[PDB]
Structures are given as C-alpha cells and as structure tokens.
C-alpha cells in the first residue's frame, strides 16, 4: 500500500502493531474480568451526555430550575439525554462495586500490585464526589436540603472545622456562591483528576499484566 | 478456540513467572479474537440496557427550593445510605465523623496487612474471608436500616 | 407495599442471569453437534 | 425518594455475582489438590 509506506518511513508505525499483536489471554480469565471495562464504558457515556447539557443549563439561583424544565419539555430529545445521564450515574457505581468484589476475591491486590489498589481507592472517592456534587444542580427541594445537611458535617472537627465549612460554602450560609463553586467542581476539576488517575491505573496494569491463576 | 503453550524453556519467562508476572505470554491471541470481536458486544449491551431503562422510566421535575419549609421526608442517593445511618444515630458528632472517615482509610491498608499470607484462592484464606463476609453483612444491614424510624435501627422491624 | 415490589424485582433479576448462562451452554452444545 | 426498580436491581445483582465467584473459586481449588 502506497499510503502505508508514507507513514511507515516517517513515524515507524510497525512497532505499535507488533506490540499489539504479541499479547495473549490466559485460560483462567473468565467473564467477571470484564467488569472493570464495563465501568469505563459508563463513564464515557456520562461525558457525552454531560457535555450536551452544558449548552442549555444556567447555574444561577434564579434560572436553574426553569432551565432544567426547558430542557425537559422543549429541546429536541432532551428528555432522553437527561434520563440517560441520570441512570448511567447509578450503573457506574454498581459496576465499580462488583469490580471491587472480583478484585478482592481473586487476590489480585497482593505483591507486586499494591499501587493499583491505592489508585483504585482514589478513583472510588472521586466518583463519590462526582455524585455528591451533581445531586444539587437543579436547585429543587431535595437537592437544596441535602446540600444544606451535607456541607455542615465537618463543623465538629476541633480547629479546622469552621474554615472548612466556609471554604465549601463560600459564605456562612448556603446560597449563590455555593452553587457557583459546586458547578465549577462538577464540570472542571473532577474530570481532570479522574483522567489523570485513570491514566495511572491503566499504565500500571499494562506494564505488569494480569495476575495468576487460583 | 486456538491456544499457545507456555514454552517453559526460555529463562526470561521463568524469571518473570517467579515474580508473579508473565501471564500475558500464553493462551489465546488478544487480537483480533478478543479486542476486535467480543468487546463491541459488551459495549452494545451496556448502552442498549441504559437506553431502555431511560425510555421506560423517565425522570421527574420536582418543586422549586423553599428555604422556609423543610420537606416531610428527604433521603440522599442509595450508595450514601450506610454512612448516613451512622450520622443520625451516634450522639457524639466527632465520633461519627471519625467513623465516617475511617472507611476509605481502612480500605487503604488492606494490601499491607494481608501480605504475610502468599495464597490467592479464598478457600486458603479463612480469616480474611470471614472478615469480608461480616463487613458485607454489616454494610447491608446499615443501608437497609437507613430508611426506617430510628428506634428500629437494631431490629429492622423483625424479632 | 414497596418492600414486596422490591423483593419481587430482585427475584426476577436473579432468575434472568441463570437463564442466560444456560442458553449460552445450549448454543455451545449445538455447535459441537454440527461438527460432524 | 424511594425508587422501586433501581433498588430492586441493586439488591438483585449482588448476591448472584458473589455466588458465581465462590463457585468458580471452589472448582479451581478442588482441581488443584
């Protein structure tokens, strides 16, 4: 192929193919080893749907509920997008829990694979943060009161309690600044941290390979 | 299908196997048997199930927030039920916060406490399996109890 | 009663998985039979 | 709120996965003795 030589003589793409076509799957791997991959799939769906809803949603105390209603009743296929976004969030967590079950019950965390376990724990915490921040964006009764109760928990710590609450809320009480900060956390910071730690996870797994038989 | 044998004569493979690696060197070819033909089936199934559930059970709208009126009943998402049940039943707030924070911290130490034993099969690790089962049962108990009156925390309405 | 509905749905979800695995094995048996 | 279908799915998919993992582990354990 004339096109193939053009790329091969410049960037040496044959090495990638040789690397890809040199791996095998041992006979002790079964269907459960799929669970992790399934989790990733759910995440990707979220991204897609999430991006779309950024073209209509307005993060202000005066406009959020009306904008959500407009998405639900006026935009072409908006109902489907919002419902899919809501269901995939729970499916992600369920699949992640099942993946943790598989990993623990096959003993795949032992030496020399401890750092993968640590990164997985970090990823789980990040997913929980995603859910908590996403819960309150519509600014309805349930989300409002849930955020009010949630942001006050760290008040019991002796010395760094009140400053932490003020940093989370952006003020003494719940209001517009809380909505702004939660939106910023939901759409900018968590995706970046998740991407970084996912890359670390996958690099470790690819470097070491899957664990041995039982 | 098709398979390839370990070829237990190359010293590099033996050295890798002695350290718990080298298990991607034998078995069935990854490409195209698995990567190209099997993964899309799983992806399609997942997406189809999510779309079907979204179509048959749409989401509600709700009511606008009112800072002067607390709703009669309010709950968080399901996967927060256990810790929630801890927060509303322990009178000492600091102890409750510590108990809530000790979950991820406790999970962080698992690989460093179980390295004395060098087996993988659960039927050769009795103590760890017992601990895991007890933890699962306790978590389910708290999660289910989170949706009832406080006085039924230790009973769930049974016995 | 919500508990009864939840329990029924859980039972149905338990049954579906076993049915699927059994059908997979049936397909394998058919393929094995057609070899000769 | 109380979501009947979501709770049913969540409480249905866990025990069966645990049982399958234990069954496969037991078969591998028996074969290697």
């Amino acid at each position: 192929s004339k096109v193939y030589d053009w790329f091969e003589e410049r960037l040496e793409i044959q090495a990638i193919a040789d690397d890809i076509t040199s791996k095998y799957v041992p006979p002790h791997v079964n269907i459960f080893y799929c669970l992790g991959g399934i989790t990733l799939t759910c995440f990707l769906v979220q991204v897609a749907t999430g991006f779309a809803m950024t073209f209509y949603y307005r993060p202000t105390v005066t406009d959020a509920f009306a904008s959500v209603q407009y998405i639900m009743t006026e935009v072409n296929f908006g109902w489907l997008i919002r419902s899919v976004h809501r269901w995939s969030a729970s499916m992600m967590v369920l699949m992640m829990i099942l993946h943790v079950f598989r990993v623990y019950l096959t003993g795949g965390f032992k030496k020399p694979r401890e750092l993968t376990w640590v990164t997985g724990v970090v990823l789980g915490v990040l997913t929980a943060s995603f859910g908590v921040t996403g819960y309150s964006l519509p600014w309805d009764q349930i989300g409002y009161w849930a955020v009010k109760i949630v942001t006050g928990v760290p008040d019991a710590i002796p010395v760094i309690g009140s400053p932490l609450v003020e940093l989370l809320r952006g003020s003494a009480s719940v209001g517009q600044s809380t909505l702004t900060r939660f939106y910023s956390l939901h759409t900018f910071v968590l995706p970046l941290l998740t991407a970084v730690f996912m890359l670390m996870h996958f690099l470790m797994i690819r470097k070491q390979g899957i664990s041995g038989p039982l | 299908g098709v398979t390839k044998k370990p070829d237990l004569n190359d010293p590099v493979l033996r050295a890798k196997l002695a350290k718990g690696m080298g298990h991607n060197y034998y078995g069935e070819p990854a490409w195209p048997n698995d990567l190209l033909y099997i993964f899309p089936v799983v992806i399609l199934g997942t997406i189809a199930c999510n779309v079907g559930l979204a179509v048959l059970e749409p989401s509600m709208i709700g009511e606008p927030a009112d800072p002067f009126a607390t709703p009669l009943e309010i709950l968080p998402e399901w996967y927060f039920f256990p810790v929630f049940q801890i927060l509303r039943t322990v009178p000492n707030k600091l102890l409750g916060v510590l108990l809530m924070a000790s979950v991820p911290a406790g999970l962080l130490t698992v690989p460093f406490l179980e390295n004395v034993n060098k087996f993988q099969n659960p039927f050769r690790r009795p103590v760890a399996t017992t601990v895991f089962l007890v933890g699962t049962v306790v978590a389910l108990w708290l999660g289910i109890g989170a949706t009832l009156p406080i006085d039924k925390s230790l009973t769930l309405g049974l016995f | 009663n919500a508990a009864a509905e939840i329990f029924r749905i859980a039972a149905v979800m338990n049954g579906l998985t076993l049915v699927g695995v059994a059908i997979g094995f049936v397909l394998l048996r058919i393929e094995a039979t057609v070899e000769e | 709120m109380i979501e009947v279908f979501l709770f049913g799915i969540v409480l249905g998919l866990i025990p069966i996965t645990l049982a399958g993992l234990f069954v496969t582990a037991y078969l591998q354990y028996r074969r290697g003795d």
Binding site: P26, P27, H28, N30, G212, P213, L214 | T3, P6, L8, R14, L17, A18, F119, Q120, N121 | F25, L28 | V23, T24, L27, Q28, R31, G32, D33
Partner: peptide, 26 residues
C-alpha cells in the same frame, strides 16, 4: 462424556496452571 464432566469442563477451562505448581512457586 457423562454430561457432568462435559459441563464441568465448560465452567472452568481444564488446561490452565494452578496455584500450587512448583514452577510458579519459585
């Protein structure tokens, strides 16, 4: 061949290594 050995050979593949193999125990 007894419809029980055949089924047992499909739940787990019977051409794998095992945890207690001396080669693995290095």
């Amino acid at each position: 061949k007894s419809f029980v050995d055949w089924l047992l050979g499909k739940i787990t593949k019977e051409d794998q290594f095992y945890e207690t193999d001396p080669i693995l125990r290095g």
